[PDB]
Symmetry: D2
Subunit: 396 residues, 4 copies
Amino acid sequence: NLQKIVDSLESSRAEREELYKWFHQHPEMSMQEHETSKRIAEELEKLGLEPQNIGVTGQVAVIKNGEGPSVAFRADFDALPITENTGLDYSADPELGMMHACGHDLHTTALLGAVRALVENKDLWSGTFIAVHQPGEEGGGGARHMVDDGLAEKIAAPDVCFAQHVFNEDPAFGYVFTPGRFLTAASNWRIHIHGEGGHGSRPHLTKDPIVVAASIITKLQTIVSREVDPNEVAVVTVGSIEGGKSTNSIPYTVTLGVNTRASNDELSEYVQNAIKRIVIAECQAAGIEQEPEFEYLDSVPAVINDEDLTEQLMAQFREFFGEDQAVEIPPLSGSEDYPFIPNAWGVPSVMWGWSGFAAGSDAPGNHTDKFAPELPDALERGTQAILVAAAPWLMK
Amino acid sequence: NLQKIVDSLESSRAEREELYKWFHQHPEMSMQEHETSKRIAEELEKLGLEPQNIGVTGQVAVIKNGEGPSVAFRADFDALPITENTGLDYSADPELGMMHACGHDLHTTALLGAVRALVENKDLWSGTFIAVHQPGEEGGGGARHMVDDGLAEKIAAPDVCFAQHVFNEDPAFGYVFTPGRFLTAASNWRIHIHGEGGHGSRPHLTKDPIVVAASIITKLQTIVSREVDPNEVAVVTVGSIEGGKSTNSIPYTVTLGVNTRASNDELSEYVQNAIKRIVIAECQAAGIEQEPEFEYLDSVPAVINDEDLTEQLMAQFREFFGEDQAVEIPPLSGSEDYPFIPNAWGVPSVMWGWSGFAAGSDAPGNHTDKFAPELPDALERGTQAILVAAAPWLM
Amino acid sequence: ENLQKIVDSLESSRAEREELYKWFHQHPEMSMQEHETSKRIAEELEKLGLEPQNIGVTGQVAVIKNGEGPSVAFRADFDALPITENTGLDYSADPELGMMHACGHDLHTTALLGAVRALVENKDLWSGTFIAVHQPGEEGGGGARHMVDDGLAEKIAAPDVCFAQHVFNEDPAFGYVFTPGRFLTAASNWRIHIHGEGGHGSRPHLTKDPIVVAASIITKLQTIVSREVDPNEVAVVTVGSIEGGKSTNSIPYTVTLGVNTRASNDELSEYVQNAIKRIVIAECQAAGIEQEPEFEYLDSVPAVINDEDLTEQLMAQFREFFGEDQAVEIPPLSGSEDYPFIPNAWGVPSVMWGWSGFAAGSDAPGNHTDKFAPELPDALERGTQAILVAAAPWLM
Amino acid sequence: AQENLQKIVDSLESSRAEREELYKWFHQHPEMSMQEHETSKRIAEELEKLGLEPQNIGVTGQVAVIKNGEGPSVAFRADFDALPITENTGLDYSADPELGMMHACGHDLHTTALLGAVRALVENKDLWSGTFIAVHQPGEEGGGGARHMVDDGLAEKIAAPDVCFAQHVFNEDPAFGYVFTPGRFLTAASNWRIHIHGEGGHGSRPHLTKDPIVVAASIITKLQTIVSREVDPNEVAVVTVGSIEGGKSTNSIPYTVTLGVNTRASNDELSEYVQNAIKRIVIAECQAAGIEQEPEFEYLDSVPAVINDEDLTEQLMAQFREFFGEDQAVEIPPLSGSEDYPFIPNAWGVPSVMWGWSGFAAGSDAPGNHTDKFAPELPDALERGTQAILVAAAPWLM
Ligand SMILES: C[C@@H](CCc1ccccc1)CCP(=O)(O)C[C@@H](CCC(N)=O)C(=O)O
Ligand SMILES: C[C@@H](CCc1ccccc1)CCP(=O)(O)C[C@@H](CCC(N)=O)C(=O)O
Ligand SMILES: C[C@@H](CCc1ccccc1)CCP(=O)(O)C[C@@H](CCC(N)=O)C(=O)O
Ligand SMILES: C[C@@H](CCc1ccccc1)CCP(=O)(O)C[C@@H](CCC(N)=O)C(=O)O
Ligand SMILES: [Zn+2]
Ligand SMILES: [Zn+2]
Ligand SMILES: [Zn+2]
Ligand SMILES: [Zn+2]
Ligand SMILES: [Zn+2]
Ligand SMILES: [Zn+2]
Ligand SMILES: [Zn+2]
Ligand SMILES: [Zn+2]
């Protein structure tokens, strides 16, 4: 019955690939995914479903098929402010300065494909499936937005909840699982350094925030290089910097965009507090009078996969796909806001990874301007995973 | 004669200040000053003159008044990409992100008021006066543009050529002169650091150009702090930096905006070549594969004022304004493209400064978001100075 | 039965063994120049009726034969560190020496000599061969390699198994810690010489100032760990010493950096060291320095890997003898060791474990602080007992 | 220029061999500031050889008064400390490189010039009239040596002269010539040791440490912004970190790093500004690293900018130009170096000039002071230094 529903996907592959390409060409910023959200709703309605608009642009649909267990599956849909440079025939317009550089369009299309399979083959399963389409995953607070907009009150809990993510992974087109800690705790901040501007030839009459900002970025390197146990995992990335316009003037303000990662909450707070200590001291070293501003954007805890359920899924994937197609890996250094969803329902959860590339780990990585999951396999594998994962509950 | 042309200015003071406030509210980028250039030409025509469009947006008007000596005077008109924060009634709209933070609007209105006073009093003077309204002074190459658009061919060389610049100087509302080296040699560059982007959590799969750019900015300080004779004058300013968008991604490119100063041409070249050496080595340190790019914007040699002509003017200004009102100062650390103008004509030249503020050097400096020369005196004193400098040739 | 009796035999010699430890504590010597320490070790072996063989400059090996049966080797190192002792112990090394046993190598040595004394005084209680290996120059001195290169494996018949241990500030208090497989990190140690051009402090423009360059290098080296290494890996770059110049008003010619690296494996170890070279060269080039920097190799070691079956066997043995509480498995440490050159020369399986020397466990001062002072009697007794407990499955 | 002047100068040929041997002796006995035992003892002996009575003032300093008839009084100062620099000249009279000491600033030459001049004066008392005071000063290289002499009662022990001079050898143009600056000649300086106190540990466990080597590196780098950003480009400022020391084993993280720091500034206000900026930076860098212990600032020495008496400088320039030739004595802009010398004439309350002379055929292309190659060339470097003293004194004494 699992094999039958998977085989039924071949009929719709050409339509599903065109839908993926459409999403690829409509990349939108966190919590502003209006065309994307509207299309997801339309696709769900096309299947006779009643998508519930939760968390501004979020969409949740319940596929009812009699008595039985209930499985939820989550897929996010926001893109990134990166100019597409893939040369794909279906590339987003480079003019947009936006790109699905993390595969969220693929996650979305995978989920819509699985929903379609389930809706069109109710003879092959029993129970309930909940499709959860989440906005704003790229530090936008999207999972929290859905939870705060009454997700757990509006939608009855499932028995289990799953999600997945595409990346440049080995084995090519295979699946990767981690029981227990899978990802890292993260935060995202903007840091505003306020100096005193002036003429480029009279620096002694200024407090030069560009020199201070440079000194800060350099000193921040010492958090990971000297302050964190070498056996732990920690990252401080400064992903953006902006200040000044004219070459011959010293500006007033420099803004830094900062991202942190750590193995656990305590160490995540440690890293963030070290950042604040350094930024304050660097301003003091320069004699800057205005306190630097720390603007919080988002934070997430480390994703922890239910141990028993991860093992159950690995056994199921190995059975269906072959032993070497589903492999256990150590935790990734990435992060995710996904668990806010299963935790609001109070249900166990597993998130896994899959490979979108024949070159596996040699392919360009997520958040490069070249990230381009390979059709047809990347889409077929993500779509099939959802069905395979659901089967022990819905076809058993 | 001079006191008579100076006194005639009160009758137009109201209109001249309205004009200044107009330019103040239309700040435009170097070489792109379409509205201010248009209004400069309109104002010249209002007086019956025939302004010639030279160097994209530049405007030169010749005021012919019988045989006699010829005097050119230059005023620049470009503004800066700074958001105005003066609080003035006539402030440029803050959402423009533009401001006359160097007083170029004042220079222009002082020259338009002086042209008007000369046109309305042709019996009180004798010879020729050239008004040169120059675009793109702020590293735009404006003076060179005018020269390369045939300024020396289209306009007959005067006997002398002058210019002034307002700043926050002592004595309040007075004048300052420097014979010989007055300013520094300068250059302006954009430098592009090309790394390899990726995910914020996987820096090992990237070549992070923000960390490299930070390293460069810090290393560049050693040019002035270790490589230049402590007795010399050198400056390396990084006035802008831009790269990345999302906080959780590592970008591909960072652009630095860089400005140099030096007391002389050889030192100016030494500084620029040191910047290149440092940028190249910092990229190599990170294992960056792409060469960094050096994008030349502009350069000027140090301004040198004719020593005899400077002394002559100092004497003239002290006689008319008062002994204490026109003083000699040591060279400033700033720069100017002005001398390409007189040098194309092959004429002796002086540029001086005047104070636009009651607080003098305690007032906000040029290129701050608060730089606002004080009416009426700031415009009054710059307008008068032009006539007073012109006198020994025309009166 | 016989294990307990041999351990119990230690009680009567406790006073003498503590004074011997204090003697070593007060004679800390530099790596490969442990003249007095080596002489005393030989004298202590001779007073037990043994024939110490001088191998590896200052190294001493004694073979204790006691009839037919298996052979066990045990290694203890004996070099100290150039750290001024600051413990306030009544048996402190003279602070004027500027030398201290800040790593407990005196304790390792005394533990081994005590266990040897037990074995020779109780030959009725065991059978087979015990090999005491006293190794110099472990602190980056290449001591293990000196012993091997001076014919250890040709002069001394291979044992069946080879062991070693190290004291540190560990939990549980006075307990033992084990790690099967990778236990430590690959390391290297270098001196790096930066050659500038000196001059008068007031005329920097006539110099190439190697202090400012050295400062630049130390800062830039932080980006190896902070940016160039996988966050999930283990890597360290420590600059442990710096020296250049004498007069405040002069710009010197040379600055020397003492540098130490750690990495989880050989490939990453080589990466880190190559990255150091690339940074040092570029920073000298950034300053316009003409003379090439010099890289002076001191020592390197691969990651210690404990034999997996043997570690399990020892874990089970220690838990049985001391209590389940008192011997625990721990994740790998970030430190390193040259020990394995010894068993790999003989071609025998090996385990190295740790023991706690402190009531406060991990809250006590750590190795290489100027306060590191393992607590008598427990620290010595537990180290001495471990050797006997580990050898017992073979000798008893 | 005079006939008696030329005669006294000519007399130097008779003593040149012994004077050069003496210079070579001093060169081979370089000693640390305020610890110049053998050099002080030899200076005293050389003055005693000439029948003079040297007075030991300021620990190792020596002053001799030569009175010879009625007339004005001229004092001349020469310093005698060396530097902790390993000599690398390859001179046959090099100091032993194992000593780790060298006269890298020419103070041995200054000293021998002064002793040679004193000898010429003592041997030719028929050619002059008045008083000459030889002032041999220790500890000039930030040792507080001029201060030590003043504090040990120089001005109460030795009657004031009418004028007081000093000179310094360097790699200057014209070759073997003289350079003068009326008014401000040098820069205000200070010298400090700065002690950074972290928390040590094992090299592989940096998270249990506060690493002072990383902090010291960040300090040295950040200190560059004082000159590069905080000081008016038209001014003169220097911040040099001349020494750094911390740690011993490569695989440990140490507890302390010491920085040796030197400042220069055109005036007293700016000098204080720079020093206070150093303290702000050091304190903030330690706080950035979360270091609990306060860093320590250990004051060594400071001097104001040397200012030469304007009229006296013009008098000396005219005198040297007459005697040596116009192109041999030139006016130069202020140098960026410093000197403690003026504490001496200021204690006596008398006008003063210090000038410079060139010790090298290659002039400014020769090795600079405080290089390990600094080697003033005999005979000319010594001859020209000795002559200058006699030429300078001549308007008063001849
Ligand atoms: C799950 C992981 C896939 C890519 C990756 C693979 C291996 C190691 C690092 C990252 C990251 C997914 P992401 O969508 O980009 C989540 C974003 C934002 C997470 C957050 N809200 O903090 C991130 O910065 O990590
Ligand atoms: C002349 C000087 C007045 C402001 C000032 C006064 C004292 C010290 C520094 C600057 C600066 C005039 P400016 O319009 O700002 C010239 C601009 C551009 C000059 C150039 N084209 O390189 C500059 O960067 O220096
Ligand atoms: C085994 C470990 C105990 C101390 C420690 C404990 C936990 C984490 C790090 C170090 C260190 C032993 P060590 O004598 O200090 C080895 C030395 C020298 C090793 C070498 N030859 O590279 C080192 O630098 O690591
Ligand atoms: C007078 C000058 C000669 C060398 C020089 C020449 C040109 C430019 C700078 C220095 C330096 C004499 P010095 O003996 O080296 C004085 C020392 C010490 C002065 C002090 N006590 O602060 C210094 O650091 O400046
Ligand atoms: Zn992403
Ligand atoms: Zn994603
Ligand atoms: Zn300007
Ligand atoms: Zn301007
Ligand atoms: Zn150790
Ligand atoms: Zn050890
Ligand atoms: Zn010196
Ligand atoms: Zn000197």
